[PDB]
Amino acid sequence: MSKTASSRNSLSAQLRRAANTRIEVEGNLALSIANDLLLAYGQSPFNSEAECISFSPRFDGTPDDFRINYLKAEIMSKYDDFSLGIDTEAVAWEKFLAAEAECALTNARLYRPDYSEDFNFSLGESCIHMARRKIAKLIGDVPSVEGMLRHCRFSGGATTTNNRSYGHPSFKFALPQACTPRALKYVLALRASTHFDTRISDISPFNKAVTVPKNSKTDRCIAIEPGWNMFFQLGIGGILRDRLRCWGIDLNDQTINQRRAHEGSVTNNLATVDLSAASDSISLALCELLLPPGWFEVLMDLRSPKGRLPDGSVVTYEKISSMGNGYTFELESLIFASLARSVCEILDLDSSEVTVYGDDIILPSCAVPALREVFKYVGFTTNTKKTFSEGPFRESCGKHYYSGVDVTPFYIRHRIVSPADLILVLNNLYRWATIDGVWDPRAHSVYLKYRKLLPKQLQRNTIPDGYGDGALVGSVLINPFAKNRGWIRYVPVITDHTRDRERAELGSYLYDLFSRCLSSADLFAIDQLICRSNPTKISRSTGKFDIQYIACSSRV
Amino acid sequence: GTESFAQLFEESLKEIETRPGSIVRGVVVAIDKDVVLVDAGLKSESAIPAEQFKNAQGELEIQVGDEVDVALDAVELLSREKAKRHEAWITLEKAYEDAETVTGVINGKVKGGFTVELNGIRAFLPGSLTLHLEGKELEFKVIKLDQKRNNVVVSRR
Amino acid sequence: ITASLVKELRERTGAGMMDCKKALTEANGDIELAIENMRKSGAIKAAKKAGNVAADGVIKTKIDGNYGIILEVNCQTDFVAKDAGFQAFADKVLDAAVAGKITDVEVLKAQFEEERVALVAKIGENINIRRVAALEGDVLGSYQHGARIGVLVAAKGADEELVKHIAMHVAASKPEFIKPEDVSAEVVEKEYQVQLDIAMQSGKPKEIAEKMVEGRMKKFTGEVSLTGQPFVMEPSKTVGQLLKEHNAEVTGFIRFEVGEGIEKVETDFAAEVAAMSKQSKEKFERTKPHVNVGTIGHVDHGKTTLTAAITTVLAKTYGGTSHVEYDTPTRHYAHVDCPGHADYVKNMITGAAQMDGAILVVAATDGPMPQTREHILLGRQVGVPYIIVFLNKCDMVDDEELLELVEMEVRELLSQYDFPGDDTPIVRGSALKALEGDAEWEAKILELAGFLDSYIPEPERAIDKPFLLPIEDVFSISGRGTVVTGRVERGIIKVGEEVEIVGIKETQKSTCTGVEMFRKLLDEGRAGENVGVLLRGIKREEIERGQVLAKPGTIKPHTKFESEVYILSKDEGGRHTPFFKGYRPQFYFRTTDVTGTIELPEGVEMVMPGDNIKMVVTLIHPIAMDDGLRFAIREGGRTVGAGVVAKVLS
């Protein structure tokens, strides 16, 4: 990128140039930081890269002893660039094909049980029958054909016909998408409901299964649904997202389960259940037994029946749908919620203490024993290690608490290469150790040390917390690079240099037209003035860094 | 007009279900001196022999802009539910019309009474109408069978 | 009895209309005798208004050499605070404090006791001299931020300019001590114990728990010292550093803010009104006009009980932003209450309260009040199209000649502010009486409702206005042509009709080649419908968001204009600090931001968060705008306030 010559000298040209330099250090810097941090906190440093992903925490000792303890077992656990020779992708497909084989056993058992087996048929069968009733009362006999279109839209992700560089919705409306045979009529019905040439590429029952990093031991197997299938799979999710609020389940707000996890770490009467590969474990049989037929028929229409792997090998899914599906997140919330709410009514507990966020469940500790028997029967594997029904520790939706104390860790994921990457690590450490701007002396020395690895200028260049990680977090009042012109101090921050790409003009027109067709008592009216629609503009990141000033505010 | 969108859709989807899943609603585009092309909405416009659209003699009274029903390529299997369950549900429907018994097992208790499993079908035992394991098999008589919503009520005796 | 004389009796002291005749009924004819026992019988009236909370009023400062005085006088509503008689009272008190160096507020209270009760009886609100303090130094200065905040500052070796700047800063940052060392050496040791427990909670080690606490201490003991605070005119340096540059030293300061520490009792107008209540034919209903009104008058005149009567009688007869709403056969109403002058202008600006007409409420037993002038004036300054008068409590006015000479008072006051006084509908009714079921007075409530339907005109529906569509994006549909999108704000756009593209760049003309939706294609674009407008000839490169389509010659571009503005407060997610003469924020108009610069009114040098203010804005680019257009003021996404285009300029 331009420029690096001796021409110019403006603060931006220097900060930009200093932002495109590289942190020249030997070995694994990310591990160097964590080690010095464990030492500053008086802890046994990492033996080798191996111990990073194998160290396990001690759920005892004072909150402080555990907050640094739990950070050790988690900080490098998701590290991207180890050299252990561990095949993250192969272990992914092993769990995938295994979780798939688990549905076949589960599908078999639920369609026609084998009472000679170990499962507790009595409680599970009576629980299904009851959850089915509570479900049919909530969602009705069939999904509203209007409410579904009310939530139909295109995801920003990739499809069977668009790589993530053509993932913007304007390219979904521009390029003919794909669809499965049972979902054909939906597309054809829509084609007959607009004058715009709604069009189809190919008819196929396949969806693309791929891999996306999850941590240092395994990747994550997700599904890339066909274009038009995702379009309506989301319409179903939206209906389920609206109906779930009746059970007190707002899938738009993680802070519910968070506060509940905090509460359970104190009262010790609430539990945080953790399921292993639960999204891949939603059998077809459990769906045909719990969902009223009108609904099940539509889910069957919109799901992908088969899926081709990156090997060329095709798998016919025993599961209803995988994690990359439009309604899978909503569906699993509904199933876990109904089963949890029904477990309570059977134990004479408050079925309102059931909170669900897809894979993440909070529950009265007195129902975990019975809930575990139900999941095991319906094909859900409960991971005993990270399921806390008693004890000082809880965890739900990114928040981790220990006797009320927030012990949420931070993750160093990638190799700290550019000054941008180091500032983020330094900032995550800042946020983890500060208390209202005040540093923790133990972590503070480590921060000052690895901050010296930044170019001299990017060291005193700070911004207030909550303005991103394009600069070190600190007091912006002493930042010598901040311009207070207009009575509004602007601060230079690092950003991703981008090159403009031409959008799909007609594609973007439809995306606009279509988004309009599907649509403190004083501070409210002011926000009405702001038109919150963003004109579609496609850009390409280049791996170079730009410096742009932003308006900032001393948080005094 | 109007006619809401969610209304123009529901009836278009309802009409699409009045045809077989192999024939499609398509509009013709450009009729040549031999072949007529239909646009079903797919990548490859369907071509049909213009001869079959003639009269008792010659000439073809169809023109561009008219919708024609064209067949789709059937190119080109869920063995788990094939565990014999569609007929397993017809067994109740036939044993209900003939007024006959059907083998079933009482798994567990419920609000209204009990849950019964008959060939993979979950039914309702009103309990009206001393156990237990291993879910002993019992001959049940079907009293009320809801055809559309899978719900069936079974009697003891 | 003898109504000509009682009219002469209102002078002196605008006493209640019935108070004057009742005062003559006992000791009859002798107007001078009536005045005297009416004067002493006012002191009891003043003790009864004592219970009424008075967290409003004024702050006044006077400096005479090396000696300054700050004072706070409380009234009930800021309508009284803007009132001539009240003001004359406070000024009289301030002069007495500086003149005699009176620092004991109780000596001051006892001195102006007779004068305030003669003022209380005349105004009817609880008026009290709250507190008074004196400050001395080598150089004194004072800053008055409106009437709500006032400051006194003492310094050494500082010119008046530097002290005036300190005074303004003190007013905006509310420090409690001069230097951080001035904070109580033992009172701070308590706050250290509160923070040593919140740290020892988890929480060790001890050397770390204390080190973190003492760290946050020096932080939150420089946020309270004047020296430690960032100078509001130069945040990069602290006031201490500012002083140490000019070789100066602050010797003391005092900051009064109106109602500080008084229990600001929150009031729910809807709750009070609602709690007091109930003690084509198809296309007609969905087309019924919406009209906004508001009651504005003295507090004890029972605006809240009249509005409770309007709701219940309209319910008994027709069967059905703290606002209340009722229905008449012809239109639907939204009824709000205007308790304060600044309160309504803030909502008049945000759009959270836009009246089409107001109901001035005067208790006939009192007649107009002295602050009734400010009540009617407020209606003038927000542009209230029409005012309807409702004389309340007419059931207790014995002589009918007394009711009429009250009308003449009201009609003259309205005429004194360009309101059609000779034509102003005045309903002689009774609110407290219409809630029982007294048809004679229940009919007067319906009479007022009739005037609302007849006197207050139907606001102009957006469909009837000239076509205008705020462009949100442009597209170049290959094979067809250029098309823009947005929701039609006003009017109707038809195919074949010509249009202008106004704003940002040179305004240009084009012809509408077609209107389009997703569901179908249309012939016209009606107001409120989201559409794309296909345009002839013009290319996509020549259009852009922020512009508007409009009928040729309807709206035009402007760059300089006058505006009423509200700056959000701290707790409203607005600015943290004040801005001054060179403010340069972002002005959001419909679809896009345009940078502009402000001209503060004369006298105004510092705008604080939560302030009303007028100011002349000059934008970097022209914008299709006309009088009344509302806009947001943003600092890079963060909404920091909003305003209303009051006057377009050149």
UniProtKB/Swiss-Prot annotation, chain A:
In the UniProt annotation, what is the result of changing residue 274 to A? Answer: Loss of RNA polymerase activity
Q: What effect is documented for mutating residue 418 to G?
A: In strain: QB_1 and Qbeta_2_FR
Result of altering residue 357 to A: Decreased initiation of RNA polymerase activity
Note the effect listed for residue 241 to A: Decreased initiation of RNA polymerase activity
Known outcome of mutating residue 359 to A: Loss of RNA polymerase activity
Q: What is the effect of changing residue 350 to A?
A: 95% loss of infectivity
Per the record, what is the consequence of mutating residue 251 to R?
In strain: QB_1 and Qbeta_2_FR
| Cofactor, how bound (note) | Binds 2 Mg(2+) per subunit, Ca(2+) is used in crystallization to prevent RNA polymerase activity.
* Gene Ontology molecular function, alphabetical: metal ion binding; nucleotide binding; RNA binding; RNA-directed RNA polymerase activity
The reported result of mutating residue 134 to A is: Complete loss of infectivity
Q: What is the effect of changing residue 153 to A?
A: Loss of RNA polymerase activity
Briefly state the protein's biological role. Answer: This is the catalytic subunit of the viral RNA-dependent RNA polymerase complex. This complex is involved in viral RNA replication that produces (+)-stranded genomes via a complementary, (-)-stranded intermediate. Binds RNA cooperatively with the host ribosomal protein S1.
Q: What is this protein called?
A: RNA-directed RNA polymerase subunit beta
Species of origin reads: Escherichia virus Qbeta
Q: Top-down, what is the taxonomic lineage of the species of origin?
A: Viruses, Riboviria, Orthornavirae, Lenarviricota, Leviviricetes
Curated annotation (Swiss-Prot), chain B:
- Please report the stretch or stretches of sequence annotated as the S1 motif domain: 21-81, 99-157
* PTM summary: Phosphorylated; probably on a serine.
Compartments, as annotated in UniProt: Cytoplasm
Induction field: Represses its own translation via the N-terminus (at protein level).
Knockout consequences: Essential, it cannot be deleted. Upon depletion cell growth and total protein synthesis become linear.
Note the subunit structure. Answer: Part of the 30S ribosomal subunit; the largest protein subunit, it is loosely associated and not always found in ribosomal crystal structures. Does not bind rRNA. Probably requires ribosomal protein uS2 to associate with the 30S subunit. Binds in the junction of the head, platform and main body of the 30S subunit; the N-terminus penetrates the 30S subunit while the C-terminus faces ribosomal protein uS2. Nascent polypeptide chains cross-link this protein in situ. Can be cross-linked to mRNA in the ribosome. (Microbial infection) During infection by bacteriophage Qbeta, part of the viral RNA-dependent RNA polymerase complex, the other subunits are the viral replicase catalytic subunit (AC P14647), host EF-Tu and EF-Ts.
Q: What is this protein called?
A: Small ribosomal subunit protein bS1
Native source species: Escherichia coli (strain K12)
> Its encoding gene is what?
rpsA
Swiss-Prot record, chain C:
Q: How does it sit in the membrane?
A: Peripheral membrane protein
Instruction: State the species of origin.
Output: Escherichia coli (strain K12)
Q: Which InterPro entries match?
A: EF-Tu_GTP-bd, EF-Tu_GTPase, EFTu-like_2, EFTU_2, G_TR_CS, P-loop_NTPase, Small_GTP-bd, T_Tr_GTP-bd_dom
- Where does the protein principally reside? cytoplasm
Where N-acetylserine occurs along the chain?
A: 280
Impact reported for residue 479 to D: Inhibits codon-induced conformational changes leading to GTPase activation on the ribosome
Gene it is expressed from = tufB
User: Where, in this chain's numbering, is GTP bound?
Assistant: 297-304, 337-341, 392-395
Effect of altering residue 545 to A?
A: 50% loss of Qbeta viral RNA polymerase activity
From the UniProt entry, list the residue stretches annotated as the region G3: 337-340
GO CC annotation, single: plasma membrane
User: Quick one: where's region G1?
Assistant: 297-304
Q: Which UniProt keywords apply?
A: Acetylation, Antibiotic resistance, Cell inner membrane, Cell membrane, Cytoplasm, Elongation factor, GTP-binding, Hydrolase, Magnesium, Membrane, Metal-binding, Methylation, Nucleotide-binding, Phosphoprotein, Protein biosynthesis, RNA-binding
This chain's protein is named Elongation factor Tu 2
Q: Where in the cell is it found?
A: Cytoplasm; Cell inner membrane
Could you provide one GO biological process annotation from this protein's UniProt record? response to antibiotic
All residue ranges annotated as the tr-type G domain in the record: 288-460
Question: N6-succinyllysine-modified residues are where?
Answer: 316, 433, 505, 509, 551, 570
Phosphothreonine-modified residues are where? 639
Q: What does this protein do?
A: GTP hydrolase that promotes the GTP-dependent binding of aminoacyl-tRNA to the A-site of ribosomes during protein biosynthesis. May play an important regulatory role in cell growth and in the bacterial response to nutrient deprivation.
